Every structure is written in C-alpha cells, then in structure tokens.
Ligand binder design. Sequence first.
Ligand SMILES: CC(C)(O)C#Cc1ccc2c(c1)-c1nc(C(N)=O)cn1CCO2
Length: 324
Amino acid sequence: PVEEYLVHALQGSVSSGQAHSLASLAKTWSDNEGVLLTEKLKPVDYEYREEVHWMTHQPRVGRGSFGEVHRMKDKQTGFQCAVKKVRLEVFRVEELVACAGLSSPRIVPLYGAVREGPWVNIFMELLEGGSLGQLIKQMGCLPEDRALYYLGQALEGLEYLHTRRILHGDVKADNVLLSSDGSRAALCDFGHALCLQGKSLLTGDYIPGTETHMAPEVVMGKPCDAKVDIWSSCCMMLHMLNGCHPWTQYFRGPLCLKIASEPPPIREIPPSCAPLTAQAIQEGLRKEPVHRASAMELRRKVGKALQEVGGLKSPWKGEYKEPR
Ligand SMILES: CC(C)(O)C#Cc1ccc2c(c1)-c1nc(C(N)=O)cn1CCO2
C-alpha cells in the first residue's frame, strides 16, 4: 500500500526532493505544498510562498500566451529562474510528467512546482534567447538553414517524448525556447500534453492546441497518436519560412473546416526551398497519420536537408525578411 503513504508525507509541505516525488504529489492537484528539484530554490520551514521566499522581478514584465510566465528570484539563494502560473482548478499533471525527470537538452529543465492557494507555480530554467515565435516576429521570417536547424532540434525533443508515450499537443514556435546565443532550442508549454498507448482527442474536458497547426485527425474527431505533433511541427516550419501561420493567407472564415476538406498546405512551401526541404515538409503534412512521418524519420530527413544546403551558416539574427 506504500504509494499512498509516500504521497501523504509530501502533502502539506514544500521540500527539496526528486522529480518522481513531485509527479506523485502533483497528481493530487490534477495549502502551501510542493517539491523543489534544485538547491537554487529552497524551502524555509516547510514553506515556499510568493513575495516571501521568492520574488518576481520588478517591473513585472509578463510572457507567454496569457502573460503567465515571469522572471523570479529566490530571496535566500539569489538564483533567478522562470515561473509559470497555472490555475489550480485546471492544472493537468501531464504538464509536469512531460518535463519531470526528463534530462534531455530539447526539453526545458524543470526546477520544481509549488501549490499556493489557487495557483500552481512551476519553476524552470531561464532561457534568455526568447521564444522561436518572438524570433519570427523580429526577423519577419527565417532563412531555410536556420528553419531546418530549429525544426530538427524540435523533432529531437518530440523523439524523446514520443519514446516515453507523451504527446506534446501544441507544437509551435511560441513553445520553443532559444538559448542566449540562438544555438539551442527547447520544447516548453506542455499544458496540452497527453500520455498514450491512439484515440479521439475531442472528448470530455480536453483543451486542444492551436487551430492553424491542428492535424486533420484532430479536427475530424479521429484517432490521434504521436503523429499529430509532426503535422504541427511542419506547420511550424511553414511559419518560420513564410512568416505567417499556414492556412491564414488563403482562408479567414473557420480554419478547422478547411483542414478537414482541403489537401494539406504543401502549396505554401516556398519555390526557393531545396528539394529535400520540400520533400520533408510534404512527409510531415500527409493527412492520414499512418502515411505521415514519425519524429525519428522526419528528424533524420531534416538533418540531411540541412546538410544538402551547406549546413547552418546564417547568423542567428541577420537582416529582416518580408513575410509572403
Ligand atoms: C514547461 C512548462 C511548465 O509546461 C512551461 C512553460 C512555458 C510556457 C510558456 C512560456 C514559457 C514557458 C517560457 N519559459 C521561458 C523560460 N524558461 O525562460 C520563457 N518563456 C516565454 C514563453 O512562454
């Protein structure tokens, strides 16, 4: 009966501990209590409380889709990190399971999680390059070598998650974080993650991902599996190359109905892209998932595509390129 007793020992306290203890505790969330995974963040007398033990950086800047991610500092240690707020009432444990104990360089490092009142505060390493989405806004669009470089890295993270039977569920540039120099990319924002065998995504309370990157099986209410992440990642590739999401420049009225009815958006592949770049995007945008490339398959092909155009040579932030 021991799992029960391990969980009760964690409840009512913030402790220094390991990812597996955190995941056990967070399942009861899905008053001050949590597990912190690094000695950079430390509890003080069984507690870790906002504005008492850790402080958000002033003035409060606000990042993420809901401005729910902030820079913060542990008052005792002085170490800085990022914190994501999730409302307790809609917290999904899968978000932690996707990044807890997952020592992979393409997954944002998790430093811990603490429940305080109506919040779940999720602590993680601070990546200073900004998001891939922000990078696209600033540059207009990315050159092909850089676009192949970051898609590869994203697919390395999806390989990792898929091998663990975890599906990201919202793969897009806004959820890829860059290192301070731009050379390392990491998946974040696992709030739509799902633990797998495949079956329909559209049942009960499920909150789905971003409409423009939705795979047709998601939209039609069909059996979904890891392959939905591949579709989205190729929609992300189109976003990088063109500087706008797929589907938006040909349709405006509800985009989910076009994804069901129309052929995939392979016409949005730029003419100037090299053959294998085009080939790879086509293999990730096959409508039926059985015919669509896995993460492993597509990552190998995106790797070769990049080699075929001379490797990564463009600077991280070059000159502006107007979106088509
Ligand atoms: C991993 C988890 C908790 O699911 C998550 C997350 C999550 C969601 C949205 C985000 C970020 C992170 C984010 N993290 C950093 C950073 N670590 O430096 C910077 N941003 C800005 C983009 O908005």
